[PDB]
Amino acid sequence: MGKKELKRGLVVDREAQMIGVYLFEDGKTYRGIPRGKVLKKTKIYAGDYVWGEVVDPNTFAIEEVEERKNLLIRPKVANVDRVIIVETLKMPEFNNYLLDNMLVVYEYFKVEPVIVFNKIDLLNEEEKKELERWISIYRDAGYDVLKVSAKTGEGIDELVDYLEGFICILAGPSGVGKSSILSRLTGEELRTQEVTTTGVRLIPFGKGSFVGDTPGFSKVEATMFVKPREVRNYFREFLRYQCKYPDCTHTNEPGCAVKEAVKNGEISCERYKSYLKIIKVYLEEIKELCRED
């Protein structure tokens, strides 16, 4: 009456001047038009949830922007529920140190990762066992991990179920299959540059999910975004110990609980070594903690 017909939408397209809004009520995308003065020093990004009014079959007047829970810087997208870090045991060769760096970075940006090992169709019997070994390490560390083959399609349905209702972004090094997976999910190709004015686009797919058509990080050094002294707050399996020993850096402290956990097999030598490498600390003691595997 004096009140507007407010409806909820999601910004799925954001280029220079334009805003594309996916209206949840009908699944249609409308041209979004901000309405108001605070509302233009109010930055609106892909991923932002908005409330507004449908003005006509092709236009939606944006009245409010919901507070966002996170904001990634590549691509520039708000409210990401899962960063899908695509990895492969081989082709390319898995690099656990770089995956650990990437996990630290996404934990810092406050986005939950899901590790997806692709190309399982290429593995021999011994490689399958090695892959299971890495999967156990990451699951024990506290992360969700899935296996898929974008080539055969195996595991893709399980991934779609896992991603229900989520806004997602694909990340991982070149060649792991990010574009192949996006193709399985949406029939679309991952956008790059030219074999600079791209924009961000979220593509609806599966059970009410959305995935970006541009990727997240490929290979990243955690300290480009996280202070070295803060890296320890982003190793998931360290957190229970840090709750009782808030100041322990897990470096030269002789009775460090994390080192004890590594010695007893509760924390993997692989993850602990990545931690020390990231903060650039060499410990002679590592030879005594890591010698069984």
Ligand SMILES: Nc1nc2c(ncn2[C@@H]2O[C@H](COP(=O)(O)OP(=O)(O)O)[C@@H](O)[C@H]2O)c(=O)[nH]1
């Ligand atoms: N054998 C096999 N090859 C795959 C699979 N997924 C992708 N590929 C191939 O891996 C290569 C790189 O895939 P692409 O999607 O471009 O990787 P991206 O650089 O991470 O986007 C291409 O030749 C894909 O056809 C898979 O599950 N099994």
Ligand SMILES: [Cl-]
């Ligand atoms: Cl500790």
Ligand SMILES: [Zn+2]
């Ligand atoms: Zn410690």
